[PDB]
């Protein structure tokens, strides 16, 4: 192969030199359940990185006059009473650089995917200040998630902090993986003003689930701009606590360098659980649901790194998509309440909607985005303006589905429109839609072109129509993409092509749609 | 003489002082984090005396990087905030540091944020209505001078536009000022508010005091007190009526709860701090009218689990004199300021504080609007034509009333150019008396949109 | 897709074998240079020529 | 392309694992080389001399108890000016006796230790129960101690016991045997570090103190090699542990002995007992580094592969060739 | 240099060692109880180092009879269990001592019960369906070959019956090695499983490790690890496909909670230990399958208080590929296997793996059942007659679908008398497509109860 | 090994001794019955739950 098999080692032996620097030592006096108390280390600083004899690492987290209670970062069983603990003079820091794209790294920045090392451009402390009020800018650029429901009803603008919140197996990781996949078109442009770099932080997930997500991203082409900061359930509570901060630091390095980042925390509930475990093991006073007093701060300190920077700082942005698992759809629990308060908007996913087939299962109405239309392109803003009111009216009218003969003409029309809009917002997994396709699809429904298609066929009628437009009338898509608005001539062309397609469309019931 | 940090458990920092120099409670102490990446000057607020010359403090800034044995210097006074005309037009944090212009106000007069409420003999024994000039507020839910107003709402319901409107009205009609106490701000929302106020040119009449969410709970708990201290200086020294916004005073309660948990105090009923009512009282009692000048406050309130019996909202509402609820449904109908006439309420809408004519007209308007809200279901399902003639007449009158509750706000002047209207209370009362009696049921509905008073109604009708 | 997966799997195993051996070959040169590398490392740690 | 990247990553994995194996073999060979090289005595001496050349280029009491103990130490310093060797021995014995009394009479210790500001009542209890039974110097210090407030009751005992030790140390100062007493204290400390059964037997304070003192005399201090001051200090300690470790206590006593004389003990570990030349060089370099006279105490540790390690205070200066070899091993890419 | 017992509190024993001989964590220590009635060698596991040369240990056998001051000797290594093909066909306890043949594996290779999970580099997702023959499982919660499967349930809803049925449906024909870890389950059912396996000649290919609930917390903690060590040996050192049945994995976390407060840990929510997630994560991650080495693990999970929001089941959910979820609501209605079709889920139920037909039928069944669940509130009060015609037809569909998901399982012959049945996946898909589409609306609903297949449906309909 | 969940509501209805057939169960089941009883009442509990 090459001489490097020896040469590298040579470079080490020629370059290696363990010099004799003075060091402050502590001694482990207690050790149990992932926490080690270290007597000594007079000059240790809070959240410092202590190194234990067996190559183990810990974070000096409680400092008393007697001992330093440190949370051990893995390999806890190798810690014993009387062991020597050396202090590294550095607060928690992680390497950061463009080399992390396509890599799976543990919360310390060390690769765990089995490939080579990562060439770090720099190091960032996990607890650096978030951008201040004066350093930010109004959220005004869309971050197309590719999910019609989110992009139409609760748009996410880069610089925003949108919470995907819902019970288990409701479609959250699916939504965030779809969002990551949707950025491939932006990535292939090569324009940093469009490129979105993704950081999927997995907290408390099993290794095979992280592997499944990585496979979904690779088969979708998203792994060339995505890093996976993985803290699998096998990892110590310290890693589950640090993983969001690791991912946030890796993203922040790009963000301050003019790039746009997309951070997915999945989940922050397990982050909170790991922090609770650490706090209770350190005997910090408990509160509601046993969480420490500063658990809110734990999440806030994190999510407030996700900001859009002013043009003086390069204009980069970091978008947060924390994922929270709500038990029995109880959004009033402690952590859900905290993160709903922190975040700028909420996609509430419900298992009832998932089973009804409303998957991706965003409960529109209850779901909100405080950034609003500022996070939408003009085409989607104008097309999807009436969508929310139509869906609200449909949910009001749903009790009348059996008496459509007895309702007013306008009410029955609203019911029929709403059913088709609901079918329109449905979307298959791992298949995000470009913003132009979403614009055309929502245009079909809001403008009434689906009013003739049967409900059960709407999903197909959309899917084919776009498949037609892309292949034959791409001028519409190109116009929407390049100009960001649905021009009148483009709208007329779109209506003409919709009508032409209607004639050739075979409804599943055998009827004709014109 | 200077203390030494002996314990650091997250935000909680214990400081050992020489026996003769233990700082008294709520004093601000300064510690230095010399680590390069996290270099800082921590402001620790003395919270307890533990004995043996130890004091337990809540760090107002993240304690990461703090080292045991680092010198802690006592300032000798509690957290002090700059006060004066200079605070107007600038954004401050809970500790009085200017965020948009660092080092600004460090040479102003500084006031401790821990001030007793007015003496009992100095309080105003009679509630006085605040004629803000908005038709909806002045008629349906009159505000209380020196009182507290809950501001229920959200995104896209014009809460920020209403805040701008009230800032303009307090600055222009009453010759007063405003202090925006951003407890638990989303830094994005805080920046948006700062730029909106600067663009509207009302920033010069408002002092912003943001305690962001990213800061530890000490600052989120003390920011309301800091902003209220600026408001108190304006009230007592400058002699100005003040308008203290507090978005969101649930945060303040929750920051108090988190601080209580950190200090080790046993949680109360629903996990709230045992002294919840006393903290809320110590905050709210200072918002009152004294010696002819008043601090009014519009305090956005979050209701956990939508449960008004929860300890936090239950304690908050013991002090709230009025309740303005902004509605998405009303906002979508073009009816700015977007106040829901039925969900909103006031505790001064009584025949005694307001005139009997005022109460009668307000109750008639409420009755009409409630009957219309009931008929909305029939209109939406069965159609307008399925109503009776009396029902159709009432529907027309209610449409016109609810559209006349809209107004050309001063905050909208920046968008359209039309000066905002300040409808006198008497004019609003007589105008709505005319509306409820059908004297204007023959004008088109578009005539009633965004117009202050009968003169504007007539002019717009003639313009259609 | 199935054909590509099968051919890539066959290529991978072919490569796994070739690597394996290539590694054994190199393992030899490795054991030849181990003596010099160890001598250099010992000299470095001792602070003087071994 | 994914398969191409897979084979490329397999190649890189092979390169990395072969390099890891080569590095492991290389440092294992270097370990053998150094083990052979360190065994020489001249080579070992040269290595430690090189380490010294490299170096050439370089309290648990809380506030109230801390201040009270400082005041008591100041009072002892004031009194010691007029003391005598026999008087100092009597002072030490009586201070130990009052320490025993306080330990036995828990209620007596608790009221003599209450944090009350009023000293008159306390002193009244004191003399009432002990005035005619002890000398004057003893009471003077033995009261100063009672007057001052203490964070905890036990601290008061730790105060008087502390003085009880100083009385003996001052005696060593009177006779000029500071070096001899320190050396004997460290010898006894290392002896008690070994044979932990003896340390545990001495530690047990439930058994009568006289039995522990007799055991110590039969084992350690009953032989002519024990210095008088060191033997007295050990007997007093064995009499006043109160659950503390014997080896722990005696090494702390030696640290106090050196501290009284302004020096700080630096525990040094070496492969062999270095000669006096590099010993005095080590003392000078350590004092220069820390700006304070140091007393080096050696410990036999051939496992250090001919290197030298120092630990003073909370700081360490490690140049042990074993530690350097471990650093080289773990530093392999 | 042996230790000495200082402090005994139930299952927790504190041991003081000489300074240089404090054992490492998770080491096995041997004390001796000499009282005649309870004489034994007591195995402790070092759980904490507590300082002053003390360690705190969790006793594996009951501490009744242990005396303070008794010599405790350190084994120098963690608890080791026998491994190899010898373990197959025998019953072991948590300590690796054979029950059906005492002293049997004492000479086998011994592996520590504690080992790190396989590295993330060696994990790949599993997407191969395991056909069990149960209609509900095969249709709505398809199991993954080499994946992680769970049978959640309340108390006494049929977890043991269903896990025994899965042993009957998966292991009887299995060519590899099976391991059954009875973690704090009932000893009667363990013996029943033992005799059932012996009669079916599956015992020769099955290793049983029992830590049943009569045992103290230590065994109920370490028995799952002891069995998982045998499973891991078969996975790694032999490459045989392995089945790993565990019943009940909740008892692991419950034993950890039982010893939690005696170990000095502050209790977390609902009284669980703070280390719930990490402790369970280590064990669960050791169970995964690595590429080319398959472990098909099925874990009966107990849900305390029938509350699926309880921290233990909620945290366990993240560790599983397929999760059948038995519910007392379905059990009350007579449906056996008692699966909640809506709450249960599987990751392999995607159109790309099970096919478009299977996926469509499963999603239509779930849709019908969810609509039925939403309507049950209306039906109980307003009556079925007031529903829409489409909704009425859907309700009739859904009742039959719920009853058709019931099946006469082989392991439940003593629950129903009738023998068990096996339904091919194709037949299940066809039958449910017919139901959801209507081909069976004319048959009585009781014809769909405990039948298992279309032929049985026809026969029972004719018998009605 | 089973439950006999006695219900107050059933007790008042005159269903004495109050066995809630749905919740109640015996996991020993037919093995703890004589063959005549097993044959006669094989599905009785499930029939009553339905
Ligand atoms: N839009 C969708 N259309 C169809 N199936 C979907 C959709 N979104 C998710 N699913 C399926 O729903 C199930 C749950 O998906 P996912 O893994 O994203 O859930 P989650 O909310 O992240 O839950 P978990 O807590 O298990 O991680 C998976 O089978 C996924 O394939
Ligand atoms: Mg997920």
mmCIF file of C-alpha atoms and ligand atoms in Angstrom, chain A residues 168-174 200 205 209 213 266-267 270 323 325, ligand 2:
data_model
loop_
_atom_site.group_PDB
_atom_site.id
_atom_site.type_symbol
_atom_site.label_atom_id
_atom_site.label_comp_id
_atom_site.label_asym_id
_atom_site.label_seq_id
_atom_site.Cartn_x
_atom_site.Cartn_y
_atom_site.Cartn_z
ATOM 1 C CA UNK A 168 -43.765 8.305 20.910
ATOM 2 C CA UNK A 169 -43.996 6.877 17.389
ATOM 3 C CA UNK A 170 -45.831 9.924 16.065
ATOM 4 C CA UNK A 171 -43.429 10.972 13.293
ATOM 5 C CA UNK A 172 -40.915 13.346 14.879
ATOM 6 C CA UNK A 173 -37.614 11.823 13.787
ATOM 7 C CA UNK A 174 -39.294 11.363 10.411
ATOM 8 C CA UNK A 200 -28.442 15.496 14.032
ATOM 9 C CA UNK A 205 -31.316 6.597 21.253
ATOM 10 C CA UNK A 209 -31.664 3.618 15.635
ATOM 11 C CA UNK A 213 -31.061 7.413 10.714
ATOM 12 C CA UNK A 266 -33.578 14.127 19.412
ATOM 13 C CA UNK A 267 -34.587 14.176 22.072
ATOM 14 C CA UNK A 270 -33.426 12.502 27.413
ATOM 15 C CA UNK A 323 -37.690 17.009 19.563
ATOM 16 C CA UNK A 325 -41.535 13.131 23.609
HETATM 17 MG MG1 LIG G 2 -37.561 9.363 17.007
#
